[PDB]
Amino acid sequence: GEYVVEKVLDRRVVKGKVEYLLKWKGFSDEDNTWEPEENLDCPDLIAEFLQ
Amino acid sequence: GEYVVEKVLDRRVVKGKVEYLLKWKGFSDEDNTWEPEENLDCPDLIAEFLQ
Structure with missing residues (x-):
């Protein structure tokens, strides 16, 4: 039932869609x-990836 | 970061894959x-759907 993102590994933009x-x-x-x-409503995880 | 399934609404089998x-x-x-x-490792939610 419960799913947790541990880490944001990477980002891509394909045909204008961010994933x-x-x-x-x-x-x-x-x-x-x-x-x-x-x-992906996850600021601490995304910021991690940005840095 | 955190994602929770509230309810299992439905099931389909398409080209042999259960979703x-x-x-x-x-x-x-x-x-x-x-x-x-x-x-989908979620027994209480799936059982809910089965009943």
């Missing part, structure tokens, strides 16, 4: 996913 | 997503 590569809590690095920014 | 329709905490009903079962 972030996310590492998930309790999942393998093999299951990282690219997610549209629209829903 | 569940999920309602997300703090998001609109407009942003429900179909998610592959492989990662």
Whole structure:
């Protein structure tokens, strides 16, 4: 039921859409996913990635 | 950073892949997503849907 982003690994802009590569809590690095920014309401994680 | 499934709305099997329709905490009903079962480690929510 509960999903937590552990780390923002990367960002891409493809055909104008911003997406972030996310590492998930309790999942393998093999299951990282690219997610549209629209829903990534995560400032501490994004700032981490920016720095 | 934190994402929580509030409710399992539906299930489909398309081209043999099982997916569940999920309602997300703090998001609109407009942003429900179909998610592959492989990662949906959520028994209380799924059982809810089964009943």
